[PDB]
Amino acid sequence: TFYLFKVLKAHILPLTNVALNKSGSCFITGSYDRTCKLWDTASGEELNTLEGHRNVVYAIAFNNPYGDKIATGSFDKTCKLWSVETGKCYHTFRGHTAEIVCLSFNPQSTLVATGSMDTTAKLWDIQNGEEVYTLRGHSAEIISLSFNTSGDRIITGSFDHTVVVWDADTGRKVNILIGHCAEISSASFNWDCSLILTGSMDKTCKLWDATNGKCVATLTGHDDEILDSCFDYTGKLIATASADGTARIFSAATRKCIAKLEGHEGEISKISFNPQGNHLLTGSSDKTARIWDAQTGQCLQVLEGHTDEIFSCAFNYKGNIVITGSKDNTCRIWR
Predict the structure, then answer these.
(1) Cβ count within 10 A of residue 3
(2) CATH number of the domain that 330 lies in?
(3) 307 and which of 21, 78, 240, 328 could share a cystine (Cβ 3.0–4.6 Å)?
(4) Is residue 77 part of a domain?
(5) Closest listed residue to residue 332, CA positions, set 304, 292, 302
(6) Is 236 within a domain?
(7) Could you tell me if 139 and 153 are in contact, meaning their C-beta atoms sit under 8 angstroms apart?
(8) Cα–Cα distance for residue pair 54/183, rounded to 1 Å
(9) Count of alpha carbons within 13 Å of 154, Cβ hemisphere only?
């Protein structure tokens, strides 16, 4: 069971993304106010404010597990890198020829890979400051992010109905996953990193082999667009969020649908498992952030407080706390 603590209104102009640190201590918030602000979960104090960008900061993440540095991607040429210790601007990355919307880091806190709407992805060096490689293999916007454990590969999802699997080693395409009939929402690796789970706007979720890049499974059930898809910490199960307004739970190995999650008055935006793998969290357009059991299908709790749609919802890494970003430019914590 979860409850509201109090309310924290992050900004008054539109909020882009919410992301927490590994132990749950910290969560970052970006917005249309050209800024990224640094909040901690316990105090609620805005630790630092990250100013310097000339536009809306959209894609932000933590250096998790390490969580000692911050990168921010914005609606310009820019990617900036900060530390969490001090709020100053460290590294400069310019070169993308369109809005930068998707970024993620590498194992060992290597360097940074940025997915931008310039139809390209780029790898930039950080201890040094170089862009080292340009990943050109898409005909459309890159919107999704993933790194495999060990960081040998990077999968780039795009609006051209294709996933391209790059190798961080060479910087060339390993294989190109083809089969989706509409824009791809999300994609990430499982525990083994042998299988890739993709979702798309063509009512389908597809399950690919990481080895050769062959499509092992095609999952049916949703009646409209798919907005998100996820494995859990174990990789045994599969969760899919859709614009059908329903949430579906499959098997990794059997792929027969195990359960349907219903009770929604709206678009389902986000999906995520707890670190334990026993309940499941949903943020949606209607009134809600809701919590389900992965095996029942029953809604264990509906917890409210936001005044409009919820685009973000995530556990911390031991399921201690839950954080949600909404369209009312407010982030709420649930203990």
Answers:
(1) 9
(2) 2.130.10.10
(3) 328
(4) no
(5) 304
(6) yes
(7) no
(8) 29
(9) 30
CA dist 202 and 189 (Å) reads 21
Indicate the DSSP class of residue 106.
Answer: P
**Residue at 286 is within a domain:** yes
Q: By what technique were these coordinates determined?
A: X-ray
Q: Which domain holds residue 331?
A: 221-335
| Distance from C-alpha of 233 to C-alpha of 190, rounded to nearest angstrom | 8
- Cα separation of 82 and 226, whole Å? 34
Q: Which two tokens stand for residue 104?
A: 């993620």
The contacts found for 177-184 with CB under 8 angstroms, 24 or more apart, are 177/206, 177/208, 177/213, 177/215, 179/206, 179/215, 179/218, 180/204, 180/206, 182/225, 183/159, 184/143, 184/144, 184/157, 184/158, 184/159
> What residues form DSSP beta bridges with 281?
272, 291
Q: Is 327 contained in some domain?
A: yes
